[PDB]
Every structure is written in structure tokens, then in C-alpha cells.
Amino acid sequence: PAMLEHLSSLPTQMDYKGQKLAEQMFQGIILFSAIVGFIYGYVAEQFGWTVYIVMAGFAFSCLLTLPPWPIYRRHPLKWLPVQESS
Amino acid sequence: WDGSAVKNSLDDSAKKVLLEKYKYVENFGLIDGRLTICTISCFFAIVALIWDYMHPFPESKPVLALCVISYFVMMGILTIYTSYKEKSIFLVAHRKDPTGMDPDDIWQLSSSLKRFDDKYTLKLTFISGRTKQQREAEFTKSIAKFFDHSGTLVMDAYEPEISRLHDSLAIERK
Amino acid sequence: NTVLSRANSLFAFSLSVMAALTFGCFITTAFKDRSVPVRLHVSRIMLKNVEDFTGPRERSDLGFITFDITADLENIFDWNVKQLFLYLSAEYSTKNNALNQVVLWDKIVLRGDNPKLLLKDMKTKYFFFDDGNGLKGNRNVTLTLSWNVVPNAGILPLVTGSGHVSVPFPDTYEITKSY
Amino acid sequence: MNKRQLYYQVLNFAMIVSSALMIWKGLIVLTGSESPIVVVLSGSMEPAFHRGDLLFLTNFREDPIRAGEIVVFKVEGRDIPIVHRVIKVHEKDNGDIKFLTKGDNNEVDDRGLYKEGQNWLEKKDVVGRARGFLPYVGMVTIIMNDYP
Ligand SMILES: *[C@@H]1O[C@H](CO)[C@@H](O[C@@H]2O[C@H](CO)[C@@H](O[C@@H]3O[C@H](CO[C@H]4O[C@H](CO)[C@@H](O)[C@H](O)[C@@H]4O)[C@@H](O)[C@H](O[C@H]4O[C@H](CO)[C@@H](O)[C@H](O)[C@@H]4O)[C@@H]3O)[C@H](O)[C@H]2NC(C)=O)[C@H](O)[C@H]1NC(C)=O
């Protein structure tokens, strides 16, 4: 019947503006850390420690991005309208 | 799965509502032209592989370079033909009984769903060739009126919406 | 959104980090567009052990050269070149047009060991022997040092130094304490 | 069945195969020689090139190969491309140039084909002069070659 297509349709609902601003700030922080690492590799003239700073920034980005935050589920309770049930 | 899969299931549900309610005639041609371009490029690739496997390289350099240039030209033509018609157009269909007269009834569909957006855009196009008239229909809706809390996209409320849209297109037609 | 999709985005961002380090290496290789000169000073060269050996493939001759070196590597070292080779090209002349500048021996040099190398009266590591034996009857041999680089990830050229030393040579004589 | 899934699989297969073989054939045409993208599998050049390093080649480029360059030839007894470094050189004025080569962490000159009747190795077994290298991709190539 039509009830099989009725169930496997909806993915996890997202806060669109919060995720867009978070992605913009994410790319800004990663690019700024890359610029600071490039200035470190230009002035202090070390390559392996520059790669270590880039990997430390990557680990910081993973710790700030990978777990699902309560902030990232609190805003879909406000930005999204109330929808019906079965 | 993904919002692109939601758009694909939405277009499939629109085609299912069309097939259950009014039964118009499908078309092809753009996907067939893309497959024709890819078949010709695969012909260039198969000829290049066989001619390189049967002949050594310093006696087979220039025409193989010509095949590389031909692949560049065919992929550029594929990109230009993508930029021609593969921007938004999805469904092409003829309507009922185009017999006895000039070929009328060009029914054309295009969809629009931006990245991280709660709004959907559907543009319908009806082209009639007797009077040479195109009719556009821009339908900007919010997606939040159709979804539910944990994975039940209601079609029993989306089907009267498509019924009202087809009534609007019937007013535009007649 | 999916956590696997976020992991794929982080993998694409790691590919962007790879592209950024490739871009930084491209800036680095675009900064070293000029070739570096190395000053060479060779003063005393002795040619001895000139033995004519009837080789089965060609009438060959054995040679042995004692030389001197004086170089400078102040502005040569950077923070991206990995390892350095040392050649010593000896240019001779034959009857069959074998106008070859040819290497006596080689040296492996790793960074962190010595920023400036200088010594005296060191003999050759590899035995010099020529098959085409054009030195016998020649009064002209040319010595010039060259040295190779290897970067971290870039293209490796060869950089030849300065100083062409022209040394004569007698006809048939065995050992000579030259200058 | 629905043929559109079959045409989409042919589409994706066409994309990946045409892209990979186009990059391969375009590189080996624009170099000039046959130029295989080779991977170092020997630990002879270990202070210079470690195990699992990628090397991309260039043409001879209208230039007689003098001493101080690395050459890549093919060992027929194992059918393996092996890189060494040119030390000595010989010249003949008819288009014939002979050369001697050596590997690091070695003591004996490599015999190969000829031993004592002629020069040490042959000028026609070389593929070309090397141009550049990657230290990161070759380790991934060795990891992919761990499961052939
Ligand atoms: C022994 O026999 C030789 C050959 O007849 C005499 O000539 C000298 O040869 C040496 C090497 O063969 C020269 O040194 C270097 O030669 C390089 C190759 O040049 C060739 O082509 C030129 C013609 O264009 C010939 O004259 C030359 O002999 C070679 O066959 C040059 O590239 C070198 O140039 C240097 O300076 C330029 C700047 O001008 C730099 O850009 C280069 O990088 C490089 O540093 C260099 O010239 C030597 O110049 C020849 N002449 C002299 C006077 O030495 C020898 O004279 C002879 N010896 C004796 C004692 O008789």
C-alpha cells in the first residue's frame, strides 16, 4: 500500500540558519588557524610543528563539532513550527 | 535520508498522483541525449584502449593526443548541454489526444529547493502551439505544513493540494 | 544530518588541508626561483698511480688523484631541502669523442650535522679508471664540483658550482707529486 | 526491471573509468615518454627516498643525460622497475651514450645484462629521467597493495 512510502521519508530535522552560521564560523576559524600556522611556518620556519598545530586545530574542531549538542536540538524546538501527528 | 531524497520522493509522489488521477503521456530526450554523449565518449575510450593495447606508444602518440582533445571537446559540449537544460527542468509530458492538429500541450515541470531552507518552489509550464502561448505557474510553499514529528509525511493532505494545483492549471488552460 | 556526513565533510576539509600545504609548498618553490652559487677553491692536485692495464673489453688505464677542497655553505641551507649529494666532475678528452665530465666519488650529507665543511688532502673513495684512456697523450683535464639537492615534496634540480681547474698530464709516467 | 538504474550505473562507471584513464593517458602523453607513475618498493635509497614514495617522471627533453641524475630501468629477472643513480658516463659521436649507475647502501656495481665484454648497463632499458616525488601518496599505495 501507500503506507510503506509514508514511513521512510523524513530525515532528522535541522535548524537551517544556526547550521549555516555554524558552518561559516567553522570555515572562518579553520581558515584563520591555517593562516596563523602559515605565518608560524614563515617566521619560525618549522614544518612539523606547523603540521602539529594544524592537527591540534583539527582535533579542536572535532571536539566542537562531532557530539550532538543540546544547543543544536534546542533551536529546532523554537525555529520549527508545530506539526501534526498520526 | 536526505533533503534531496525528500525532493526525489516528492517528485515521484507527484508523478504517482498524476498517474492515479489524469494519466498523461511521458517523454524523454534530455537523459537520452546525455546517454548518447556518454556512449560516444565511451566509444572514444574503448577505441583508445584497444589501439593503445595493440600498438606501442611512440608510434601511437599523436592520434591518442587527438582522442584526449576529443574527450575534452565532448565533455565541454556535455557541460554546455548541462547548462542549457539541466538547471531545473525535471518532467516532460504530452497531454491527452494531440491528434488531428499541430502538436500542442507541452507540460513542463521544474523544482527548486535551496540548501538549508524550509521553503519549496515548483514551477509549471504549459506551452500551446495553436495560439503560441506559454503559461507559467510559480508555486512557493512552506514545507512545514506537510511533515510530521517522527517520520510520517502525510500524502492524504498533499493529494488535495495537488488537486487544487491541477484545478488552477485547468483554469489557466481553459 | 548524519555523523558520517560530518565525517565526510571533515575528510574533504582534510583534503583541503592537503591542498593548503601543497599551496604553501608551491609558494616555497616559487620563492627559490634563483639558483644559489657556491664558492670553490682547489689549490693542490696530485696525479699518481697511472697504470696501463690491458682490459678484455678495451685497453684501459687506472688513475688516482689527491686533491683539496674549500667551500662555503652559509646561505645554502633552507628548512625544506632534505638531503644533499656531492659530486666532482672531471672533464677529459679522447680519440673517439668521449668528451665526458665524470664523477670520482660521492658523499651523503644529512642536515643537523655540519653547516660548513672544509678540510684538506683527502684521497678518493672510489677508484678512478677509464676505458677509453684518452688522458694518455692529453695535456688538459678540467675539474669542477657539482652537488645535488632533494626537497621535502617538490622537484629536484642539479646545481653546479663555480671553478674550472685545468691540469696538464704527461705522456707515459707512473707517479707524480704535482701541485 | 527498470532500465534507468542500469543506465545510471553505466553513467557512473563511465564517469569513474573515463576520468581515471583520461588522467593517466593525458599525463603519459603530455610527459613525452611512456612515463609510469612509479612507487619505490626498495630500501636502497632510504636516506633519500623512504619505503612507499611516489615518483612521477619526465621526458629526456632533447637533452643528453649527464651524470648526477636518477634513472629507472626494468629488471627482467624479476620484471620490476628499479631506480638507481648515474655516476660515470661515456660518449660516442653518433648518438650513442653509455653510462654507469649505482644504488645507495651498496658496494658493488650492478651487473644486469653485460658483465665484462661491454659497458655495465644498456642505454635502452631506461624509461626516462625522474622529475618529482610525493612522500605521502606512496604510503597509501603500499597500504592499498597490502590487500591486492
Ligand atoms: C681544455 O679544453 C677545453 C675545450 O677545448 C678548453 O676550453 C674550456 O672548456 C671548459 C669546459 O669544456 C669551459 O668551461 C665551461 O664550459 C661550459 C660548456 O661550454 C661549452 O661550449 C663553449 C662554447 O659555447 C666552449 O667554449 C666550451 O669549451 C664548452 O665546450 C660553459 O657552459 C661554462 O660557462 C660558465 O660560465 C657561464 C657564464 O658565461 C655560466 O653561465 C656557466 O654556468 C658556467 O659557469 C664554462 O665556460 C671553458 O670556458 C673553456 N675555455 C677556457 C678558456 O677555459 C680549455 O681552455 C682547455 N684548457 C687548456 C688549459 O688548454
The domain boundary residue, chosen from B85, B107, B129:
B85
Residues B52 and B118 reside in one and the same domain: no
Q: DSSP strand E in chain B: where?
A: 25-26, 89-94, 106-112, 119-128, 133-142
Specify if B56 maps to a domain.
yes
**Are the C-beta atoms of B41 and B79 separated by less than 8 Å?**
no
Distance (Å, rounded) from C-alpha B114 to C-alpha B108? 20
Query: Total structural domains in chain B?
Result: 2
Residues B101 and B167 reside in one and the same domain: yes
CA of C144 to the centre of ligand 1 (A): 11
Residues B79 and B110 reside in one and the same domain: no
Return the residue in B2, B7, B10, B116 with the most chain A beta carbons within 10 A, the one to mutate for interface testing: B116
Domain span at residue B69?
A: 32-85
Specify if A28 maps to a domain.
yes
**Rounded to 5 degrees, what are φ and ψ at D93?**
-90, 55
Distance (Å, rounded) from C-alpha D96 to C-alpha B148? 81
Partners of residue B31 in chain D, C-beta under 8 Å: 4, 7
Helix axes of B61-85 and B30-53: crossing angle, nearest 10 degrees: 170
Three cell numbers written together for B153? 509525511
Distance (Å, rounded) from C-alpha D112 to C-alpha C113? 36
Give the chain A residue whose CA is nearest to the CA of B17. A2
Distance (Å, rounded) from C-alpha C26 to C-alpha C47? 46
Got the DSSP string for chain A?
-TTTTTTTT------HHHHHHHHHHHHHHHHHHHHHHHHHHHHT--SHHHHHHHHHHHHHHHHHHSSPPSHHHHTHHHHSPP----
Contacts with C170 (C-beta within 8 Å, 6 or more apart), sequence order: C176
Q: Does D92 touch chain C (CB under 8 A)?
A: yes
Residues B100 and B155 reside in one and the same domain: yes
Q: Cell 682490459, residue?
A: C55
Reported resolution, Å = 4.9
Order of all β-strands in the sheet with D96-102: D70-75, D80-92, D96-102
Distance (Å, rounded) from C-alpha D55 to C-alpha D135? 9
Q: Is the CB of C164 within 6 Å of ligand 1?
A: yes
Residues B113 and B130 reside in one and the same domain: yes
**Pairing assessment for the beta strands C146-151 and C81-86 based on DSSP bridges:** antiparallel
**Are the C-beta atoms of C11 and A74 separated by less than 8 Å?**
no
Q: Does C19 touch chain D (CB under 8 A)?
A: no
Task: Name residue C51's beta-bridge partners.
Answer: C62
CA distances from residue D56 to B124, C154, D17, D38, D134 in whole angstroms, order as listed: 54, 11, 21, 7, 8
Q: Is the CB of C22 within 6 Å of ligand 1?
A: no
Residues B169 and B100 reside in one and the same domain: yes
Residues B63 and B128 reside in one and the same domain: no
**How far away is chain B from the Cα of D58, in angstroms, using its nearest Cα?**
15
**How far away is chain C from the Cα of D97, in angstroms, using its nearest Cα?**
9
The domain boundary residue, chosen from B60, B85, B110:
B85
Distance (Å, rounded) from C-alpha A35 to C-alpha A3? 53
Specify if A29 maps to a domain.
yes
Method by which the coordinates were obtained: cryo-EM
Please write down the HEC assignment for all residues of C93-124: CCCCCCCCEEECCCEEEECCCCCCCCCCCCEC
Q: Does C15 touch chain D (CB under 8 A)?
A: no
Residues B105 and B162 reside in one and the same domain: yes
Specify if B140 maps to a domain.
yes
Identify the CA nearest to A69 among candidates B144, B116, C1, C4.
C1
Q: Does B73 touch chain D (CB under 8 A)?
A: no
Partners of residue A12 in chain C, C-beta under 8 Å: 1-2
Contact D25 B48 (CB under 8 A): yes
Give the chain D residue whose CA is nearest to the CA of C147. D68
The domain boundary residue, chosen from B85, B107, B130:
B85
Distance (Å, rounded) from C-alpha D121 to C-alpha D73? 10
Query: Total structural domains in chain A?
Result: 1
Nearest Cβ partner for A34 among C1, C10, C20: C20
Domain span at residue A37?
A: 22-79
Specify if A39 maps to a domain.
yes
The contacts found for D95-104 with CB under 8 angstroms, 24 or more apart, are: D96/D123, D97/D64, D97/D65, D97/D123, D98/D123, D99/D65, D99/D67, D99/D71, D99/D123, D101/D71, D102/C106, D103/D44, D103/D45, D104/C108, D104/D44, D104/D45, D104/D46, D104/D47, D104/D48
Q: Do chains D and A touch (3 or more CB pairs under 8 A)?
A: no
Three cell numbers written together for D112? 644486469
Q: Is the CB of C176 within 6 Å of ligand 1?
A: no
Give the chain B residue whose CA is nearest to the CA of D15. B38
Contact C17 A58 (CB under 8 A): yes
Distance from first CA to last CA of chain C, Å, rounded?
Answer: 81
Contact B152 A7 (CB under 8 A): yes
